[PDB]
Amino acid sequence: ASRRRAMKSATDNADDLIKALTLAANRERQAQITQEISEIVGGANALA
Amino acid sequence: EFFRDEQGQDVLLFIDNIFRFTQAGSEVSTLLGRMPSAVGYQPTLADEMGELQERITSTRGRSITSMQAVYVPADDYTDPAPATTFAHLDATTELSRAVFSKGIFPAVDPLASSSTILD
Amino acid sequence: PAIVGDEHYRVAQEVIRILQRYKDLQDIIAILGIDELSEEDKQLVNRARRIERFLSQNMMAAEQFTGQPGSTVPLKETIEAFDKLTKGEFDHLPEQAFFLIGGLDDLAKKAESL
Amino acid sequence: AGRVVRITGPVVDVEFPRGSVPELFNALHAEITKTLTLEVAQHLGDSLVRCISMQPTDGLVRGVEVTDTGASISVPVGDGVKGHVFNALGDCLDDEHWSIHRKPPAFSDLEPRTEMLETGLKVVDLLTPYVRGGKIALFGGAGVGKTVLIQEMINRIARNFGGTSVFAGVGERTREGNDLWVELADANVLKDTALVFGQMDEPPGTRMRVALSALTMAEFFRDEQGQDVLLFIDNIFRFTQAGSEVSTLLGRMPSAVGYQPTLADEMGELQERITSTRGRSITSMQAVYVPADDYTDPAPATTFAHLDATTELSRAVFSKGIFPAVDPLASSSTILDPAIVGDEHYRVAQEVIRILQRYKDLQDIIAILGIDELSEEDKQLVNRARRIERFLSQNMMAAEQFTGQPGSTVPLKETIEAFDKLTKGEFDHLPEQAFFLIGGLDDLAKKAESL
Amino acid sequence: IGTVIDAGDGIAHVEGLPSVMTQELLEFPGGVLGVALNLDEHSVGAVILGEFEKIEEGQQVKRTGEVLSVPVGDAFLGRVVNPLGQPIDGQGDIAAETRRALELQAPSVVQRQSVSEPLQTGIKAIDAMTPIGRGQRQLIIGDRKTGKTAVCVDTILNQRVRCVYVAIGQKGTTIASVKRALEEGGAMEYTTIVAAPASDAAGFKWLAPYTGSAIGQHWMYNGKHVLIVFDDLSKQADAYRAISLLLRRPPGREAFPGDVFYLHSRLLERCAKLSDELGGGSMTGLPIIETKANDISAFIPTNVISITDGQCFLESDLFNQGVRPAINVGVSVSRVGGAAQIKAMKEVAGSLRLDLSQYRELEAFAAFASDLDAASKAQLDRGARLVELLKQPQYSPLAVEEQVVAIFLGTQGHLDSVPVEDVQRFESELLEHVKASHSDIFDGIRETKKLSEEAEEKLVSVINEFKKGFXXXXXXXXXXX
Amino acid sequence: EIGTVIDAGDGIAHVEGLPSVMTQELLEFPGGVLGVALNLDEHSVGAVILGEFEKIEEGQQVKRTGEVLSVPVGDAFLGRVVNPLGQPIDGQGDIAAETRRALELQAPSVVQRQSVSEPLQTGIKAIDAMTPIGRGQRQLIIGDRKTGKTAVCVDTILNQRVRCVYVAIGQKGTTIASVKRALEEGGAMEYTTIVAAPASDAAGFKWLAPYTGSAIGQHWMYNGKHVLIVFDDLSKQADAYRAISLLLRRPPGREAFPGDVFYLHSRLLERCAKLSDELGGGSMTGLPIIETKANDISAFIPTNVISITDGQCFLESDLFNQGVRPAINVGVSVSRVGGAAQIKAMKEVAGSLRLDLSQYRELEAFAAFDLDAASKAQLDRGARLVELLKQPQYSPLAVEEQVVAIFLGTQGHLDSVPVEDVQRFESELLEHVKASHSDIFDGIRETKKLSEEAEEKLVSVINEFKKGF
Ligand SMILES: Nc1ncnc2c1ncn2[C@@H]1O[C@H](COP(=O)(O)OP(=O)(O)O)[C@@H](O)[C@H]1O
Ligand SMILES: Nc1ncnc2c1ncn2[C@@H]1O[C@H](COP(=O)(O)OP(=O)(O)O)[C@@H](O)[C@H]1O
Ligand SMILES: Nc1ncnc2c1ncn2[C@@H]1O[C@H](COP(=O)(O)OP(=O)(O)O)[C@@H](O)[C@H]1O
Ligand SMILES: [Mg+2]
Ligand SMILES: [Mg+2]
Ligand SMILES: [Mg+2]
Incomplete structure (x- = not known):
């Protein structure tokens, strides 16, 4: 009965952890794309 | 729009896929020589989409109901492309394989699917 | 140890040690909790949480924000307070007693009310 | 004769008389106010030639005379090259000359190699066995253990081999070059080894071409004399790095992760020349740097395509103290099939990988819960997996200064039998420390008693 | 006639050629060819299809008056050629008068x-779950050393339909080993090998797919079936990126040009199933993409995924764990589906996908043995055995009739008695028995394209008899209970 | 020859004229401010200003010196504080030295x-034992802020009481003053040169600061004398060069850095070497520093320097806060020279010490997740070894004292004693041996080895002391 309670909370916490990391991943994913492109375009504009 | 305005009747508009317009927008934007925005999209992403979506609207005479398909890159709803689209939209119909496998037609997911006007 | 003396340096680092270990166990505590930790770790976590809340203090400028007036704690009071916390003299007191207090007298006074 | 117009680092622009413009990749000499060798790169227009310097451009002046040789950078070739030290330009650093630039062999001339090169190392022979006349790659992060491994492979294999060798120090430590010189001198293997050096000290122009000079020498040993040649390159990444440096200054728009747009092309021209032909074969042992421990990086990502065997060194395994720190899952070999290496070897190799893979999957669960929640079967698999990881560790002959104990060489038969017994679970009683840093099975049992 | 002003990095700016066509073949004075891409105000940007070492400022370039075209025919079968269509193998010249343009419009x-015509790969995992039809485009995507090329080679061997293996940015020794593999199997006779290796310029890599497609189209329009393999488009994309950046075209996402999607679009679309009016020929496509750390979200992968008619995602974790081929069932899809399957396979592997979807959901519970009920336990035991059937050794394509029997065995629960580790050997020995004795069952499936009620009862008896004979490798044997 | 400035701003100046100007030639503006001709264009000369450019304008006259960048060198610089150019800032008279050296010189072939094969003793147990540094070696000191990077370098300099060269780049003045004060207290300033290019100074000074410090050290190196140089730090010098390159309009790459940012650090560090017997046999050891952000070793500039240097000493924040000081991560940190840069005494005792502690940290993590006997003993041993490696700030120990302390732990003489009492046991033990058994220390100093007699002597001394403790 106590395990049921203990592992139920653990699962609910795991769900929350996944959501926080997934957002952080997408934050980084979008950022890395944005950052790389700005450096590439920056070098292109330098010449012409 | 002409079927809407002149004929005076509720017309259906089926778009598959609306994302590919935005994708095409990015492709031309780069070649034209516009500096890219967030996640390498065109700077006029919201504007291009805005001009299209706003035309799809109900007039006093009659309406046009748009049933659109929308791609979500990387299963990422935070991505600018799907993020901007969601602002324009009223309703969603999520078809699930679980309900299709049972033999329930149409296999609309009753929990996941939603509508803004349900008030 | 040259400027601020050996005692202050000893207490300062000892507090950091406890808070560091607490932060390391955050990942494990997030899923499982306090129950799966050992007897020693259980006590360290209890002390760490109480130390975190004791570091909180009433600000003189923040009367409009909090409501209660601010409190100023001398160096001698500070050193002695964290000395007793590290040794574990205030293990009996609740977590709410440490929240938003200056001196040691105010800790004991709020402890009775709760 | 020409005249210097513009100078911007190791890039130099030169004017020439209309109609007498040097060809591409042609060596141009210029007197310093020493002789600086420039190599042609681009034709800007109005009889202007953009060139890449092969030495520092400090002391140059605008309007200085530049002589055209009328040919690409030439380097010495033959038996005289053996037991000597050279630079990128092909000048003796110890106090016929063919061009470095040349097309790769035809498809008809290329032979597919399917022969085992027995190293002696357990991790390599089992999981990623190297090929005679193949291309072998030591992938690793920053300061992990690439040079120590390449020195080991030299030490083990080269002595026993009757063929000659060619070492190419592309953009590496001059200190390590001095250490290598003394190491080869003591072993008395200098006589059957040619050395080429273009260390990180030198400009990017050298690091670009230094690889070609060493390769050209090896190609003649292959083609003409008809010899099975060894080619040691450390590090191949530094060529690609140098490629990026020149590319930016020339005024090419950068590609992904700020690399040159012609990354795959530059690499392609070099790597394809390094091949074993039907007539005569060449075994290339290359070292490869992996920036940011990132295998997705274009530089290491492109290199992978060229290689027949690969050895991926990971920091996680290095941090444990497992030497050599070869990633058993990531690392791969083309020859690992039942046809070449027999059904038994293939069976044991894959079975070891299966156990290590499952262990890696359970790391996340073990981190939180532990061993207790795992089943009886899983508990045993984890125990075996840990023991297998530690058995893969081995004493290196080169690493006497590091470890202390002398190195050990393990034959193929010993390797196969050892991992056979481990998978079956015959050594379940023995402790974890018994498997750490041992060669043969006798040494396992001997250390088991002491503990 | 025109004169070169600038030259370097496999690019050349040309003065003159006032009425030059776009994508026109130019000839430099050393015999090296070029392609006029950018027609500027006072120059012509040209990419060199060859060595540019003896191409200089002042050298004379002439017009051919032709857009890129390459010879085609039956002569190319069993030959190794470059994009331009020159043989590298060294087995004489290519006798063929018929020619085709590289750039041609796809069927409307x-x-x-x-x-509605199956193209059998001979791989249980693919044919059953993610079937490929004649005219379909099925992407083969995954990390390095996941078994992408292996699947394509096994597919080509199973056709023993004309094959066209296009190699882009590959090392020579790999292309040689692929050719050697086809010779051993004896599938080279009906296989054309287009090769643009790493040493070659970017132009060759850029052209390599279009040349391979053009060769296939000749058969397609004549009313014959073709299979083309791009290995791989990742490197061809990288090649085009290089060209565009050298020509000073503005970069976008991941330093790629705007028309990097458009590059792959025109290529893949040309693969189609023609109407009855135009013969009714086909041209199946198996493009490949090399992901980095299983990143499906990346720009180039997403582009090709959105074009192709389903994908076969290979995983590293699965490959290392022993699942070979390492096809992820959940992510991988076939857009055509049952239409590209014979009725026999459709029936048996209709609810195979459902059972394995339930298995993966349950899988977590499997470790905790005998803590569950009966229904879930049976599903785990069934699912575990089904995985072993989907496993298949390299260079061993199975016939369609052999696959249906193997799946029918597992799905109906004929392997439940047999241990999980002995499933692979049970399958092999069973097929050998049916091949020898009960060939009529295979013959029936070949002709009718369905499993009869008679054949079902026949198989049951054959299985039961074999179980008794079968000596279990691990521990004691077990037939039925 | 004479030239005229056309453009000026941001510490950059375009010059008309100077037709036959050399590359990297020293130019002199009419206010007495110096400059460096980097870019020799068709009809201009791009120059970087090494000073204040407030009174440098369009029309101002610039002259040639006819010399590539050079800086004075000698014994005069010892106990002095100078800028990159070599002008004293301390205010203790001028630098009397006729001998000069060029900044840009080729490293030994x-x-x-x-x-x-010559140890350079830092006096730190963690370093000397696990990650030893030899004369001519390049050992990177990398980690986050307030991890104890500078502290290690200062302690190293104090232990040499070998010429020292503390190069400060992008440092605040008060820090450089406190470092100088620390050297005066210890009495290590007399053999220490302090090159300083603080934050206020232009990018040019920061860019030059390492090359000037190296040039000063090379004078001793070629004469057949040993040197130690400290770059604090190359992270800021990289940032300085990035600024210059971007102002000159050179195309940026990864993390907005130029292509030759790796090449910048390469030529600098390589000049640090151990010369042959033919060229005297002098040395020049390097201790470069890199400031990581959130323990990001994967970053561009760190990876560049890591790939150049001969081993790294990665400091961690978590370890530092937890009480492990110095906070050297054993698993990640490495010495490429290794045993060669250790005396025979240390080589024997601390032969497999780094490997044992790498296994300990692995097991420590796995221990958290009923164990047997073998693993338990390793954890108890490992835990005690960590306490020995702990060392207070500004307290370098002699090599003979270290070997005894490590020999104690490794052989398992501290197994009986509690873990918390290991630090006091070490201190009191050394005091005993210093007083009574000085002959054991003296033996190790001279022979550089532990004799079989000395081993048995130590064992008896330890056992006798344990009883008294
Ligand atoms: N089904 C399989 N069973 C066993 N081994 C396989 C299978 N498929 C591939 N392999 C082996 O694994 C390797 C995979 O490498 P490769 O085909 O180059 O993958 P990719 O083309 O994705 O890089 C091949 O060399 C092959 O020998
Ligand atoms: N071994 C040590 N033991 C105790 N404290 C130390 C030790 N090393 C450094 N410190 C302290 O830590 C702080 C940071 O040292 P510092 O060398 O300035 O690090 P960084 O160079 O990363 O800023 C200083 O205040 C110093 O007194
Ligand atoms: N097999 C090994 N055994 C023991 N120590 C090793 C081994 N490989 C590497 N090391 C340690 O790590 C260091 C890294 O070596 P090196 O190959 O020079 O670095 P890089 O990978 O940057 O070339 C070695 O000098 C040594 O101290
Ligand atoms: Mg190295
Ligand atoms: Mg492949
Ligand atoms: Mg500091």
Whole structure:
């Protein structure tokens, strides 16, 4: 009965952890794309 | 729009896929020589989409109901492309394989699917 | 140890040690909790949480924000307070007693009310 | 004769008389106010030639005379090259000359190699066995253990081999070059080894071409004399790095992760020349740097395509103290099939990988819960997996200064039998420390008693 | 006639050629060819299809008056050629008068028919779950050393339909080993090998797919079936990126040009199933993409995924764990589906996908043995055995009739008595027995394209008899209970 | 020859004229401010200003010196504080030295070197034992802010009481003053040169600061004398060069850095070497520093320097806060020279010490997740070894004292004693041996080895002391 309670909370916490990391991943994913492109375009504009 | 305005009747508009317009927008934007925005999209992403979506609207005479398909890159709803689209939209119909496998037609997911006007 | 003396340096680092270990166990505590930790770790976590809340203090400028007036704690009071916390003299007191207090007298006074 | 117009680092622009413009990749000499060798790169227009310097451009002046040789950078070739030290330009650093630039062999001339090169190392022979006349790659992060491994492979294999060798120090430590010189001198293997050096000290122009000079020498040993040649390159990444440096200054728009747009092309021209032909074969042992421990990086990502065997060194395994720190899952070999290496070897190799893979999957669960929640079967698999990881560790002959104990060489038969017994679970009683840093099975049992 | 002003990095700016066509073949004075891409105000940007070491400022370039075209025919079968169509193998010249342009428009909406003809790869995992039809485009995507090329080679061997293996940015020794593999199997006779290796310029890599497609189209329009393999488009994309950046075209996402999607679009679309009016020929495509750390979200992967008619995602974790081929069932899809399957396979592998979807959901519970009920336990035991059937050794394509029997065995629960580790050997020995004795069952499936009620009862008896004979490798044997 | 400035701003100046100007030539503006001709264009000369450019304008006259960048060198610089150019800032008279050296000089060739087999004792147990540094070696000191990077370098300099060269780049003045004050207290300033290019100074000074410090050290190196140089730090010098390159309009790459940012650090560090017997046999050890952000080793500039240097000493924040000081991560940190840069005494006792502690940290993590006997003993041993490696700030220990302390732990003489009492046991033990058994220390100093007699002597001394403790 106590395990049921203990592992139920653990699962609910795991769900929350996944959501926080997934957002952080997408934050980084979008950022890395944005950052790389700005450096590439920056070098292109330098010449012409 | 002409079927809407002149004929005076509720017309259906089926778009598959609306994302590919935005994708095409990015492709031309780069070649034209516009500096890219967030996640390498065109700077006029919201504007291009805005001009299209706003035309799809109900007039006093009659309406046009748009049933659109929308791609979500990387299963990422935070991505600018799907993020901007969601602002324009009223309703969603999520078809699930679980309900299709049972033999329930149409296999609309009753929990996941939603509508803004349900008030 | 040259400027601020050996005692202050000893207490300062000892507090950091406890808070560091607490932060390391955050990942494990997030899923499982306090129950799966050992007897020693259980006590360290209890002390760490109480130390975190004791570091909180009433600000003189923040009367409009909090409501209660601010409190100023001398160096001698500070050193002695964290000395007793590290040794574990205030293990009996609740977590709410440490929240938003200056001196040691105010800790004991709020402890009775709760 | 020409005249210097513009100078911007190791890039130099030169004017020439209309109609007498040097060809591409042609060596141009210029007197310093020493002789600086420039190599042609681009034709800007109005009889202007953009060139890449092969030495520092400090002391140059605008309007200085530049002589055209009328040919690409030439380097010495033959038996005289053996037991000597050279630079990128092909000048003796110890106090016929063919061009470095040349097309790769035809498809008809290329032979597919399917022969085992027995190293002696357990991790390599089992999981990623190297090929005679193949291309072998030591992938690793920053300061992990690439040079120590390449020195080991030299030490083990080269002595026993009757063929000659060619070492190419592309953009590496001059200190390590001095250490290598003394190491080869003591072993008395200098006589059957040619050395080429273009260390990180030198400009990017050298690091670009230094690889070609060493390769050209090896190609003649292959083609003409008809010899099975060894080619040691450390590090191949530094060529690609140098490629990026020149590319930016020339005024090419950068590609992904700020690399040159012609990354795959530059690499392609070099790597394809390094091949074993039907007539005569060449075994290339290359070292490869992996920036940011990132295998997705274009530089290491492109290199992978060229290689027949690969050895991926990971920091996680290095941090444990497992030497050599070869990633058993990531690392791969083309020859690992039942046809070449027999059904038994293939069976044991894959079975070891299966156990290590499952262990890696359970790391996340073990981190939180532990061993207790795992089943009886899983508990045993984890125990075996840990023991297998530690058995893969081995004493290196080169690493006497590091470890202390002398190195050990393990034959193929010993390797196969050892991992056979481990998978079956015959050594379940023995402790974890018994498997750490041992060669043969006798040494396992001997250390088991002491503990 | 025109004169070169600038030259370097496999690019050349040309003065003159006032009335030059776009994508026109130019000839430098050393015999090296070029392609006029950018027609500027006072220059012509040209990419060199060859060595540019003896191409200089002042050298004379002439017009051919032709857009890129390459010879085609039956002569190319069993030959190894470059994009231009020159043989590298060294087995004489290519005798063929018929030619085709590289850039040609794909079949229109009206000039197509719905794909309803199976193309059997001979791989249980693919044929059953993610079937490929004649005219379909099925992407093979995954990390390095996941078994992408292996699947394509096994597919080509199973056709023993004309094959066209296009190699882009590959090392020579790999292309040689692929050719050697085809010779051993004896599948080279009906296989054309287009090769643009790493040493070659970017132009060759850029052209390599278009040349391979053009060769296949000749058969397609004549009313014959073709299979083309791009290995791989990742490197061809990288090649085009290099060209565009050298020509000073503005970069976008991941330093790629705007028309990097458009590059792959025109290529893949040309693969189609023509109408009955235009013969009714086909041209199946198996493009490949090399992901980095299983990143499906990346720009180039997403582009090709959105074009192709389903994908076969290979995983590293699965490959290392022993699941070979390492096809992720959940992510991988076939857009054509049952239409590109014979009725026999459709029936048996109709609810195979459902059972394995339930298995993966349950899988977590499997470790905790005998803590569950009966229903879930049976599903785990069934699912575990089904995985072993989907496993298949390299260079061993199975016939369709052999696959249906193997799946029918597992799905109906004939392997439940047999241990999980002995499933692979049970399958092999069973097929050998049926091949020898009960060939009529295989013959029935070949002709009728369905499993009869007679054949079902026949198989049951054959299985039961074999179980008794079968000596279990691990521990004691077990037939039935 | 004479030239005129056309453009000026941001510490950059375009010059008309100077037709036959050399590359990297020293130019002199009419206010007395110096400059460096980097870019020799068709009809202009791009120059970087090494000073204040507030009174540098369009029309101002610039002259040639006819010399590539050079800086004075000698014994005069010892106990002085100077800028990159070599002008004293301390205010203790001028630098009397006729001898000069060029900043840009080629490093020793392959033939003009000898294998590093001479220990340079930092006086830190963690470093000397696990990650030893030899004379001519390059050992990177990398980690986050307030991890104890500078502290290690200062302690190293104090232990040499070998010429020292503390190069400060992008540092605040008060920090450089406190470092100088620390050297005065210890009494290590007399043999220490302090090159300083603080934050206020232009990018040019920061860019030059390492090359000037190296040039000063090379004078001793070629004369056949040993040197130690400290770059604090190359992270800021990289940032300075990035600024210059971007102002000159050079195309940026990864993390907005130029292509030759790796090449910048390469030529600098390589000049640090151990010369051959033919060229005297002098040395020049390097201790470069890199400031990581959130323990990001994967970053561009760190990876560049890591790939150049001969081993790294990665400091961690978590370890530092937890009480492990110095906070050297054993698993990640490495010495490429290794045993060669250790005396025979240390080599024997601390032969497999780094490996044992790498296994300990692995097991420590796995221990958290009923164990047997073998693993338990390793954890108890490992835990005690960590306490020995802990060392207070500004307290370098002699090599003979270290070997005894490590020999104690490794052989398992501290197994009986509690873990918390290991630190006091070490201190009191050394005091006993210093007083009574000085002959054991003296033996190790001279022979550089532990004799079988000395081993048995130590064992008896330990056992006797344990009873008294
Ligand atoms: N089904 C399989 N069973 C066993 N081994 C396989 C299978 N498929 C591939 N392999 C082996 O694994 C390797 C995979 O490498 P490769 O085909 O180059 O993958 P990719 O083309 O994705 O890089 C091949 O060399 C092959 O020998
Ligand atoms: N071994 C040590 N033991 C105790 N404290 C130390 C030790 N090393 C450094 N410190 C302290 O830590 C702080 C940071 O040292 P510092 O060398 O300035 O690090 P960083 O160079 O990363 O800023 C200083 O205040 C110093 O007194
Ligand atoms: N097999 C090994 N055994 C023991 N120590 C090793 C081994 N490989 C590497 N090391 C340690 O790590 C260091 C890294 O070596 P090196 O190959 O020079 O670095 P890089 O990978 O940057 O070339 C070695 O000098 C040594 O101290
Ligand atoms: Mg190295
Ligand atoms: Mg492949
Ligand atoms: Mg500091």
